Design a binder for this molecule. Structure first.
Ligand code: UXB
Ligand code: UXB
Lengths: 237, 300
């Protein structure tokens, strides 16, 4: 069934699974035309496919050329997501294929189930959680590779950096979701927090700064203040 | 005109013959039904006064044999049987007819309702859905499950309707996933019509038989199959023009005949709203949309 608060620790067991987020697959800018009408211009997107246990991220870059000459692009985007996820699974050795795929938005369920009919033993599940994966394009190195791409491309990351050397998957995922929630609620503040200290750098092969254990505690606290604050600034409390 | 004579009526029962029904009291002098129109299938069905649980009945065609009803006090139901001695059957029918112990199939000359509900239903196809090949008539009841239901437990007592599943390899061509799911023409025209049913008449036959088993027996898997076969047509962008026109007439008479107080269970809100208002064929079912809006505007 659905993934929710009550079966949360299932993400961190030894059954391979992946999250699939499609919120950045079809991205547009809306502008006025010379005639004074409105039109959209697509920009490159990405499928966000993440193993929450290992941190492995399969970032498929959706180049704008995908949409050329196509109609109903928001509906297509969900199938295109599903086509790419199924192609990924098919490309992995059997012992690496997921046993479950959890979609962040219910509208991906039918597109993915249809594309995965060849895999009856892979459960396709929704979730009741409001996960902040849409903010992945607030991670500079991810946004950069997406916007620079001149063709379809798959790029591999570990979104946990080397965190698992020191913390459990459960704690890595909780840190990730806090960072992403912060970035989604107030990107400017969030990014200020992460960089304010020029001495803490980001390794060329990492996405986030090389914080110590103690510095992560401080950072994590600062991001929770931000999220609570923006909740007051938004709701006036 | 043909006749279904009865050995007797030992238990109080509501008897139905097609869209009509009448009450027989316990041990009332009742010896069957006469003036049944030749040329159609028919169904004779039962609901005991003591246990409205289990509606049951018998699909039959008088052109295929001489059939009678005789109550079985061991199994506790009215059973259809065949009399192979034609002379003995005629004499027994003639005796009951002279003693006026039979009720008359109450058909008004101007009423084509039963024809319209059964236009494409053929006894030979019924007998393949309801497998019991030693008899020329077919037993159905409320509780019989369908083959598709059984996949999701006795196979001999199943309804072998054609399985229809929109999220199946049969329904979806590799590489046309989005195309074939959002437009089921491939699945309707190539897989089902050309492949399985062979023609639209056989398709409509099963569609009409499913509806009638849902209406007369409250057979839930039949209702599922009726809706699915409607939805497969409505969800196909490319349907022969003759099929759309006939579907509209088919469904019109089904909706017209449905008991008003059974619409809440027998009609699937989602399928009807999608079919009438969202699907490719939302403009193609004018008679059906008009009777549905005037009779069941709630459902919509
Ligand atoms: N089984 C017989 C009983 C007569 O011996 C039967 C045959 C024909 C019609 C009817 Cl009502 C019954
Ligand atoms: N309900 C009445 C007829 C009204 O149509 C009735 C009585 C006796 C036999 C049959 Cl089939 C029907």
């Amino acid at each position: 069934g659905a993934m929710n608060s009550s079966n949360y620790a299932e993400l961190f067991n030894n059954d391979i699974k992946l999250f699939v987020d499609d919120t950045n697959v079809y991205r547009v800018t809306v502008h006025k035309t010379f005639e004074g009408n409105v039109a959209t211009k697509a920009i490159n997107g990405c499928i966000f496919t993440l193993n929450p246990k290992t941190g492995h991220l399969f970032l498929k870059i959706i180049h704008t050329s995908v949409w050329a000459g196509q109609k109903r692009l928001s509906q297509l985007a969900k199938w295109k997501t599903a086509e790419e996820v199924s192609a990924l699974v098919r490309s992995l050795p059997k012992e690496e294929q997921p046993k479950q795929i959890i979609v962040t938005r219910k509208a991906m369920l039918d597109p993915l189930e249809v594309h995965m009919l060849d895999f009856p033993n892979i459960a396709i599940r929704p979730t009741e959680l409001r996960l902040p994966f849409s903010a992945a394009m607030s991670i500079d190195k991810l946004s950069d590779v997406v916007m620079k791409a001149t063709e379809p491309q798959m790029v591999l990351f570990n979104i946990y950096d080397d965190w698992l050397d020191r913390i459990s998957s459960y704690t890595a995922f909780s840190r990730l979701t806090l960072l992403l929630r912060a970035l989604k609620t107030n990107e400017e503040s969030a990014k200020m927090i992460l960089l304010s200290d020029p001495t803490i750098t980001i390794k060329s092969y990492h996405l986030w700064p090389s914080f110590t254990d103690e510095q992560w505690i401080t950072i994590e606290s600062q991001m929770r203040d931000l999220i609570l604050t923006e909740y007051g600034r938004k709701y006036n409390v | 005109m043909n006749t279904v004579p009865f050995t007797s009526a030992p238990i109080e029962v509501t008897i139905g013959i097609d869209q009509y029904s009448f009450n027989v009291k316990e041990n009332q002098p009742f010896h069957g039904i006469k003036d049944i129109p030749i040329g159609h299938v028919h169904v004779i069905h039962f609901q005991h006064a003591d246990n409205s649980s289990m509606r049951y009945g018998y699909w039959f065609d008088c052109r295929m044999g001489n059939f009678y009803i005789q109550y079985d006090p061991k199994d506790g139901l009215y059973k259809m049987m065949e009399e192979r001695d034609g002379a003995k059957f005629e004499n027994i029918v003639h005796n009951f007819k002279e003693r006026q112990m039979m009720v008359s199939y109450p058909k008004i000359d101007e009423d084509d309702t039963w024809y319209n509900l059964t236009e494409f239903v053929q006894m030979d196809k019924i007998r393949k859905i309801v497998r019991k090949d030693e008899n020329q008539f077919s037993y159905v009841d409320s509780s019989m499950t369908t083959v598709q239901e059984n996949e999701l437990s006795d196979p001999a007592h199943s309804l072998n309707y054609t399985v229809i599943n929109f999220k199946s390899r049969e329904a979806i061509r590799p590489g046309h996933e989005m195309e074939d799911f959002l437009d089921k023409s491939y699945y309707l025209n190539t897989v089902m019509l050309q492949g399985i049913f062979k023609n639209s008449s056989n398709y409509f036959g099963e569609l009409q038989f499913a509806f009638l088993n849902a209406m007369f027996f409250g057979n839930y898997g039949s209702s599922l199959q009726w809706h699915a076969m409607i939805e497969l047509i409505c969800s196909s962008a490319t349907v022969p023009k003759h099929m759309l026109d006939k579907l509209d007439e088919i469904l019109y008479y089904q909706i017209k005949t449905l008991p008003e107080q059974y619409s809440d269970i027998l009609l699937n809100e989602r399928v009807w709203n999608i079919c009438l208002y969202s699907s490719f064929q939302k403009n193609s079912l004018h008679n059906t949309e008009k009777i549905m809006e005037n009779k069941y505007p709630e459902l919509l």
